[PDB]
């Protein structure tokens, strides 16, 4: 068993299975597009017999828009929170906001509520090698996951609003669900999730172009498509047939696939 870096989330990896001349590779969720705190998936020219992949589916421009909106809200003094359950996206947003505030040099507050976020921060700062190269290099200067934009007490929904950035992870009735009761009720008390609202969600999974790049790099004689919409995988399989004339598969749930091999 040999593992290869995936970069979908911290600790995510893709496995290369080999026995004799046989070779099977299964990746699950990955992404060619690097994250703000993670590296892109990399693999040699393994050229395996079979490849299993996901078919599910302006990043810097979206980041600029999100940062500009958050900056405008905090400059105006408005309070907006980001209710998100994903740990990887939450940590990426936390790193982005922390470095943005540090670069701007201002001292506006930003905190995170749930203790699970603190546990995730502890695991992240412990496991440096599974992150982006800037994190690894800046580790020499000082720890970057630690900052004045730390933990949240919030006087249990009694510390009032302000130029604040907060994170809540409900779920669907978990976490401090009273945050909505304390906040909102007016246009100024904005609450933005994926007075206005926009889709700040970042696509952790890569698009079809990333899958095309990976299959072009590895170049297996056969490919297997799972974990995605039916339309997406059908279109991707048709595009693979049109572009490469390389054998592929579209197995349904429980479908038995058999492949000949040359030992």
């Amino acid at each position: 068993i040999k593992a290869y870096y995936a970069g979908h989330v911290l600790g995510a990896a893709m496995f290369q299975i080999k026995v004799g001349s046989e070779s099977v590779v299964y990746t699950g969720d990955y992404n060619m597009t690097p994250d703000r705190h993670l590296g892109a998936a990399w693999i040699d020219k393994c050229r395996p017999n079979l490849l299993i992949t996901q078919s599910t589916y302006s990043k810097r421009c979206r980041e600029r828009d999100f940062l500009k909106k958050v900056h405008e809200t905090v400059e105006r003094g408005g309070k907006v929170l980001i209710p998100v359950f994903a740990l990887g996206r939450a940590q990426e947003l936390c790193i982005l906001l922390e470095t943005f505030w540090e670069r701007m040099n201002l001292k506006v507050p930003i905190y995170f509520s749930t203790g699970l976020t603190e546990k995730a921060n502890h695991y992240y700062k412990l496991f440096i090698p599974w992150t982006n190269q800037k994190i690894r290099k800046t580790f020499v200067q000082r720890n970057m996951f630690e900052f004045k934009h730390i933990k949240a007490f919030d006087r249990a929904f009694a510390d009032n609003p302000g130029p604040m950035v907060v994170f809540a992870t409900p779920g669907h009735a978990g976490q401090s669900l009273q945050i909505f009761r304390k906040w909102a009720g007016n246009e100024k008390n904005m609450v933005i999730m994926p007075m206005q609202v926009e889709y700040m969600s970042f696509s952790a999974h890569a698009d079809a172009k990333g899958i095309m790049q990976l299959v072009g790099q590895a170049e297996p004689e056969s490919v297997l498509l799972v974990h995605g919409e039916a339309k997406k995988m059908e279109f991707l399989k048709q595009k693979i047939e049109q572009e490469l004339r390389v054998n592929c598969y579209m197995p349904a749930n429980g479908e038995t696939v058999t492949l000949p091999t040359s030992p």
Partner: protein, 818 residues
């Protein structure tokens, strides 16, 4: 002594001790005849010995000897090719091919030798060992000029990747030699691009070379019937090759892709968008996880935009995204490229607000980069200029130290956008339609910034000044006199020459007149140096020389010359102090001033010799033991001999001088007793002529000024005793010949302990010509003191002793107890 080497080699045991002896002989240097002998001895022992490692070492030593500059390697080349024909071991064969590389580099002129080397190289290329194949391919690449290209091209398909890398490197070397390449190499390299390994792909640079050589050449696609130029298909190759996962290969591909500026912009626009596999190549490059790849992509964008303006207009947005980049260096370089390509593009409100956003950032250097950008950027709407000004004023409030750069920005904004500014004049000056506004606070940063913008806008436009109030004109006059560089609308030499000529003509007066003239002239020279900074070098140089002459003259008129030696008393003596001062000033003349030629060094050393003679005279006067007189006189005669042998080519131009008269009397001085010789040299020194110092063409005095402690303060650097407190040192060094070696920082504790420090050559940095910055972190420690005390630090200019070099700065230190 080749016999010693021969017998030592013979006595040495063959298996082990021979290797050590040859290594020891190799480390020590060698001479031409010694090389010519030891090479034959090595060849004879190479024939005699049959071990692999020993023969390998002999081949390595042959290579080392071949690199000797003074040797004439002709027969040893013949013996080398002979043993090459006879050689069997592949490692030793590769070492001998290294020696052939050495000889080919040494002598690239002989055509017969070149063809002999290439034919024997291709003969030995039949060997199965990969190393000898690599060495032979290196020889083929190095040796060329008008079949070898086809031969190495056949070896492109070799199984060993190292041989393929050697082949492509040989092709690159051959191209560097300038030979005209073929076109079949393109498809061969295209085949090489599919190779698994990284060095082969990175080297296969070769397609860039062939694309540059024949960019207009038509090439047919193997599958598609359509015809595509070499430039475009090579561009597509590099585009879909950048997707490779080898980051070094990605950086190489991006860098060499930037060097291509002979391709149509339509194809670039097609391949840069997100909607073949060549789409979004630059999108992937700028989004790449390694900042090296992104920097290389930025450079490629710079070159291509300098080629095509439409592509630049298309790619502005991606550069704006790079202004949001998390790495600071990437942001800086992207901003610099945007500045480089701003001459044609014009921004929109989105671009302008995004650019002004990153200007808010805290780091000073990126803000300076934004300032450089805005100096050249275009703009369409007056509201863009208004936004620029408002964000710049916010920046003034945040970071006032950048005021000069922002004023430069507004200068360029006004000059390059005059018409677009003046509709915004009455709002910027806040002039009321009918009221008379209160006079704005002059010397304010923001108001000066606004005025600089307005005035630089008004330089071309004639309708602008009519909207100015009276106090605006008054402030215009104020700014114009104070900030002229921002706000828009030799008798001395010949005097110095004739003064020196006056001194040279009138030196023959009596001692009183000579002293008076010398005093007046040194005063005049000092005043000229103070008055004009250009001539300060020659002025201070001449002042030091004439002060040496004055000190020599005054010493010779002292009372002790007409009192017997027993009656002499050294408490009132001035000759010893005079000699000391002349010595120090001669050292200052020699080393402090830069640009001094040999014709000045001879006179400086002559004055030093006269000072040494005076020292000998006074020491003979004060002492009474014959033996110290004999020793001192012998040492002085040794110095005279050293001087006259050092400057043999200059004695005819020192007629009637002290050293000339000493040379005329040299045998008598050498033979005579200490009393007779000291008396005759004393009376000789009195009648010595005054040499005419030749003025250098250009000369500057060296000087340093410490600025990190500044003029200090009462505040002492408290710290525990015994431990060390580090003090920063900053100084501005000017016209120092070799500051990293000659300049030494010195710190004097308030006692006899005068610690000395040698700054490392790395810390010395050169911001501009004729000067040197010096950043040092000197470390100071001492035991406990009863109270805070002052510690002195000074710059010293070392030579081959040392002299003071700058004003002695001092700082207060308070080492607290344990």
């Amino acid at each position: 002594k080749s016999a010693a080497l021969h017998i030592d080699l013979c006595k040495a045991t063959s298996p082990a001790d021979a290797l050590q002896y040859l290594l020891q002989f190799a480390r020590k240097p060698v001479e031409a005849e010694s090389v010519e002998g030891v090479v034959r001895i090595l060849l004879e022992h190479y024939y005699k010995e049959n071990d692999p490692s020993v023969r390998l070492k002999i081949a390595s030593l042959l290579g080392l000897l071949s690199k000797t500059a003074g040797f004439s390697p002709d027969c040893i080349m013949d013996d080398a090719i002979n043993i090459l024909q006879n050689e069997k071991s592949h490692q030793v064969l590769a070492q001998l091919l290294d020696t052939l590389l050495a000889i080919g580099t040494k002598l690239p002129e002989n055509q017969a030798i070149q063809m002999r080397l290439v034919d024997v190289a291709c003969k030995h290329l039949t060997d199965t060992s990969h190393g000898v194949r690599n060495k032979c391919l290196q020889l083929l690449g190095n040796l060329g000029s008008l079949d070898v290209q086809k031969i190495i091209g056949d070896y492109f398909s070799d199984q060993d990747p190292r041989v393929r890398t050697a082949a492509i490197k040989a092709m690159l070397q051959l191209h560097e030699r300038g030979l005209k390449l073929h076109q079949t190499i393109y498809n061969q390299a295209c085949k090489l691009l599919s190779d698994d390994y990284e060095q082969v792909r990175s080297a296969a640079q070769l397609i860039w070379v062939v694309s540059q050589l024949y960019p207009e050449s038509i090439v047919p696609i193997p599958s598609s019937n359509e015809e595509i130029r070499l430039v475009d298909d090579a561009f597509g190759k590099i585009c879909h090759m950048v997707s490779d996962g080898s980051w070094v290969v990605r950086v190489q591909a991006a860098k060499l892709l930037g060097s291509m500026e002979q391709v149509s912009s339509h194809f670039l626009e097609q391949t840069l968008d997100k909607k073949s596999g060549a789409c979004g190549a630059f999108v992937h490059g700028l989004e790449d996880e390694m900042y090296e790849v992104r920097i290389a992509a930025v450079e490629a964008l710079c070159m291509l935009a300098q080629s095509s303006p439409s592509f630049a207009e298309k790619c502005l947005d991606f550069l704006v995204d790079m202004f949001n980049d998390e790495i600071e260096e990437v942001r800086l370089q992207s901003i610099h490229t945007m500045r480089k390509i701003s001459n044609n593009i014009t921004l929109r409100e989105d671009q302008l607000d995004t650019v002004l956003a990153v200007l808010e950032d805290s780091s000073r250097d990126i803000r300076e980069a934004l300032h450089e950008l805005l100096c050249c950027t275009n703009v369409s709407t007056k509201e863009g200029i208004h936004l620029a000004l408002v964000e710049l004023l916010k920046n003034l409030t945040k970071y006032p130290t950048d005021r000069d750069s922002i004023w430069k920005c507004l200068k360029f904004l006004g000059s390059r956008h005059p018409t677009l500014v003046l509709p915004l004049v009455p709002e910027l000056l806040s002039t009321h339609p009918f009221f008379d506004t209160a006079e704005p606070d002059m010397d304010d940063p923001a108001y000066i910034a606004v005025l600089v913008l307005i005035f630089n806008a008004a330089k071309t436009c004639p309708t602008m000044p009519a909207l100015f109030s009276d106090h605006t004109f008054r402030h215009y006059a104020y700014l114009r006199d104070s900030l002229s560089h921002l706000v828009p609308a030799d008798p001395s030499q010949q005097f110095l020459q004739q003064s020196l000529e006056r001194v040279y003509s009138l030196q023959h007066l009596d001692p009183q007149g000579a002293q008076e003239l010398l005093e007046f002239t040194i005063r005049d020279l000092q005043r000229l140096g103070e008055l004009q900074s250009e001539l300060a070098g020659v002025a201070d140089f001449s002042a030091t020389y004439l002060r040496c002459q004055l000190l020599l003259i005054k010493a010779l008129q002292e009372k002790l010359w007409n009192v017997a030696a027993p009656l002499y008393l050294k408490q009132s003596d001035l000759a010893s102090a005079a000699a000391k001062q002349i010595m120090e000033e001669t050292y200052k003349m020699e080393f402090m001033y830069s640009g001094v030629e040999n014709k000045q060094v001879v006179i400086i050393h002559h004055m030093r010799l006269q000072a040494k003679a005076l020292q000998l005279i006074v020491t003979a006067r004060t002492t009474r033991g014959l033996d110290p007189l004999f020793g001192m006189c012998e040492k002085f005669l040794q110095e005279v001999d050293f001087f006259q042998r050092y400057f043999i080519a200059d004695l005819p131009h020192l007629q009637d001088s002290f050293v000339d008269k000493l040379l005329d009397l040299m045998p008598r001085l050498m033979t005579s007793k200490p009393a007779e010789v000291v008396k005759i040299l004393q009376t000789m020194l009195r009648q010595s002529a005054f040499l005419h110092l030749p003025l250098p063409e250009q000369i500057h005095k060296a000087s340093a000024t410490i600025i990190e402690p500044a003029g200090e303060s009462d505040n002492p650097l408290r710290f525990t005793s015994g431990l060390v407190v580090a003090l920063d040192v900053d100084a501005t060094l000017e016209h120092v010949q070799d500051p990293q070696n000659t300049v030494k920082v010195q710190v004097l504790y308030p006692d006899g302990q005068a610690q000395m420090i040698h700054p490392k050559p790395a810390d010395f940095r050169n911001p501009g010509p004729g000067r040197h910055r010096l950043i040092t972190q000197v470390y100071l420690s001492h035991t406990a003191w009863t109270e805070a005390c002052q510690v002195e630090v000074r710059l010293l200019l070392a030579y081959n002793g040392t002299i003071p070099f700058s004003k002695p700065v001092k700082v207060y230190i308070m080492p607290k107890p344990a």
